[PDB]
Amino acid sequence: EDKLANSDKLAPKLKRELEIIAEDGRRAKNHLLEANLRLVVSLAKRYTGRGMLFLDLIQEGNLGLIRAVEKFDYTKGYKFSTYATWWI
DNA sequence: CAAGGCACATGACAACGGTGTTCAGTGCCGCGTTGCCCGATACCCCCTACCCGTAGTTGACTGGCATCCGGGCGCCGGGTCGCC
């Protein structure tokens, strides 16, 4: 998608291939998000009972997880579950 | 005895007496209005102290919560699956 964003002309087939791999990356993103939805529910339960509805805390944890995924990469030699909980 | 001569007073004649009025000019005391002079007060500036919003923090850590019955009472009204 970075290459697609550039104004320089790319012939259409390679641009479509770039879009396809970008869509596959988005699907991987969604897979990771659904994988850790369980993580945030436990973390939100870790903070329930303080004037905020449990499902509202779960949604806010979902937002934090979205941030963590958008800022997570394998360059760190650690699992995702360790890096996520801080941002959650 | 009648006519002509001299005294005192007399028809007017202005000008003083004394006092009252005229324009006018200017003040003389009463009532009210005005420039100062300051003094405080709103209103620009500079400085830093502290409130408040945003963004990171990497061992691992991946599904909870306690409900709820002793109304009571009846009806409406619809759903809901058997029934033959």
UniProtKB/Swiss-Prot annotation:
Region of interest (Binds RNA polymerase-binding protein RbpA), ranges: 1-88
Which residue intervals make up region (Sigma-70 factor domain-2)? 32-88
- Per UniProt, the short sequence motif Interaction with polymerase core subunit RpoC occupies residue numbers 56-59
Q: Which domain of life is it from?
A: Bacteria
Q: What does this protein do?
A: Sigma factors are initiation factors that promote the attachment of RNA polymerase to specific initiation sites and are then released. This sigma factor is the primary sigma factor during exponential growth. Its activity is stimulated by RbpA.
Assembly, per entry? Homotrimer (Potential). interacts transiently with the RNA polymerase core complex. Interacts with RNA polymerase-binding protein RbpA via its sigma-2 region (residues 211-347) in a free form.
Q: Which family does it belong to?
A: Belongs to the sigma-70 factor family.
Put simply, this protein is called RNA polymerase principal sigma factor HrdB
Question: What species is this protein from?
Answer: Streptomyces coelicolor (strain ATCC BAA-471 / A3(2) / M145)
Lineage, opening ranks: Bacteria, Bacillati, Actinomycetota, Actinomycetes, Kitasatosporales
- What is the primary gene name for this protein? hrdB
Full protein stretch here: 247 to 334 of 511
